[PDB]
């Protein structure tokens, strides 16, 4: 279980994370689609595939920084 | 449940699956684009609608084969 | 991920969609049952099965257009995935 | 569990599924027709009521066999 | 789906559950009885066939009521 | 798990199921019966209570058997 | 019915207060039974003794369960 | 893997084999523990006595689970 | 089952979690740590062992507290 | 199909050229959680581990695309 206070604090932490990361998540989701789109073309274009793969690597690293930032906040706050 | 029939079903399915693998793959590829376009930062409605019309025709061709399959079965008495 | 505001716009876009396609979805279901009836009939009738396949195809084409309007609406409101 | 019982449990069920397959197929077919009608733009109680009768009849004929198998099965001393 | 459609279906089903409490309950009793007989040490065919006929009948009464229900739903325009 | 244990376990369970098949099928026939009775329109305390006593009796004998096999399992060193 | 719901509450309510002690006691003897069956060196006299205690407890409780079941039927509830 | 899948059974078998007796007592001691909690009047001293008995058995099981986890990792298994 | 009881049990359990919170967090941390060591490229037995023990302790303290709760519950008549 | 072979060849190799990576990434992940669940987090140690996790994952995805691409050229769905 969790306290009223703990939940409150955790709710703000996650809300910020979501808000601060919205565009990023949506761009990543959009890029996997494109990735999958390309992999399933009739005649696969390896160049485009790799380019889209690298875009995903870039977005993904940014997104991990935000999560870690959020994890550390949670731990500093003393939450489970 | 019969051997005669059993061999009738798989033959229709395999003909169905073999006569449609390209379309299916193309339909899947196209849903991925559709979703990609929908999730872009500035959705391009013209592009999105064009891709939906492609899906619509691919899917029309598929359903057509699906009805053949279904009707081959009814006729096989299976 | 969705905020109070976003939950509501999405909900409204979906209700609108349900309401507008309501009779169209019912008809589509009715044809799907009829089709299955035909396929399971004691002695199968290809003409009827085919004619019913077409009615379904046309109804489904109308339904999908409505879904595209809906998905596009959603995208235009900035609502995630 | 015993041999002569398994022999009788198979012959009992196999017979039933053979004696039963046309009836189940017709009944399934009408279950669909009945639903197709109940979902028609404007409901037609006559055909709906009619189809419903076709189903009862098919079901009575189907339970009549259900009983028959259950009885054989009990006379054979099986659970 | 719609709140008013949900309210309307609820009344239709409630009316049905009330108009049939006694049949349901009776059919359930005959169901149990039927199995009590089938699992007797010495199964009594005649007695079982008679229970089947009582269930057959309760069953049709029940069905007609279902059709009323289904038609009533179709009539309210509930999916 | 072990081999000489599986044989022993399998043998004990089979005697149990054989020495109790008829008793077990009878208890089932009475649970169905009890329920049929509890579910009639006009309930009959007398028969209900009669059947309850027959189940208490069958169950006593049956539990007596289960303990007989739990001891066997335990005496053989099985989990 | 309204009346229906209430009486059952009392019926079921009477039943629970008339068996809290037995229920608990049988749960305990069943734990004890299993304890003995799983002992390093099983004592079949001890095991049988507990099986007898369970039998009594069970009988007394099944006897209440019928009283309960009879009440309900008499009060016309499923 | 395949050749390493064998190598795992071997390590688990030993673990299962060496811990049978412990595991069974732990199970029995846990049943008495519960039989005691559900006694008509819970006896604190006895309950704590059984609990300490579970500690030990527990510590002895853990102590073998660790030899196992270690045997695995050294076998270089996932 | 009773409201009054429900409240008592909820209260006994609230106490338990509140009081074992830091302890539960330390055990979770150590389990992770332990798994980290197991999956190291070249496993280190001394430190794995060292961690097994640290978990052993925390685990015993945690069990003492589970027993206290079970007894609490026991005497409260729940 | 008659191509389920190539699919395995392409996956097995993916796996073999990856085992050490996946395992080290699992270890680092465990180490990451062990640190977040400490009573008071050491944000320095946590960040260093997140970086270790970040490269491993980047190396691993690179192999995964290689693998996906292969499948695509094998004409395998």
Task: Give an overview of the whole structure.
The structure is a homodecamer. With 80 residues, chain A is an all-alpha fold. Chain A has a single domain (1-80), classed as Up-down Bundle (Four Helix Bundle (Hemerythrin (Met), subunit A)), CATH 1.20.120.1490. Chain A contains two helices and no strands. Chain A has helices spanning 4-39, 46-76. The longest helix of chain A is centred in the first third of the chain and has 36 residues, at 4-39. The C-D interface holds C 23, 26-27, 29-31, 33-34, 36-37, 40-42 and D 22, 25-26, 28-30, 32-33, 35-37, 39-41. The PDB classes it as metal binding protein. The entry lists the keywords Zinc resistance-associated protein, Salmonella typhimurium LT2, zraP, Structural Genomics, Center for Structural Genomics of Infectious Diseases, csgid, metal binding protein. The assembly is decameric.
Features of the shown structure:
homodecamer, 80 residues, mainly alpha, Four Helix Bundle (Hemerythrin (Met), subunit A), zinc ion binding (chain C), periplasm (chain C), Signaling pathway modulator ZraP (chain C), stress response (chain C), zinc (chain C)
Major interchain interface with per-chain residue totals: F-G, 20 and 21 residues
Structural class of chain A: mainly alpha
Please give the radius of gyration of chain A in angstroms. Answer: 17 Å
Mind telling me the CATH class of chain A?
Mainly Alpha
Helical percent range of chain A?
over 70%
**Count of distinct strands of chain A:** 0
Q: Can you name the CATH architecture of chain A?
A: Up-down Bundle
Give the termini separation of chain A. Answer: 9 Å
- What's the CATH topology label of chain A? Four Helix Bundle (Hemerythrin (Met), subunit A)
Assembly type: homodecamer
**Silhouette of chain A:** elongated
What characterizes the major β-sheet of chain A? Answer: none
Number of domains of chain A: 1
Number of helices of chain A: 2
Q: Per DSSP, what share of the residues of chain A sits in E-state strands of 2 or more residues?
A: under 5%
Along the chain, the helix and strand elements of chain A come as HH
């Amino acid at each position: 279980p969790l306290t009223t206070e703990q939940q409150a604090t955790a709710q703000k932490i996650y809300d910020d994370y979501y808000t601060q990361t919205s565009a990023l998540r949506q761009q990543l989701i959009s890029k996997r689609y494109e990735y999958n789109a390309l992999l399933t073309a009739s005649s696969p274009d390896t160049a485009k595939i790799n380019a889209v793969a690298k875009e995903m690597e870039s977005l993904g690293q940014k997104l991990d920084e935000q999560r870690v930032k959020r994890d550390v906040a949670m731990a500093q706050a003393g939450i489970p």
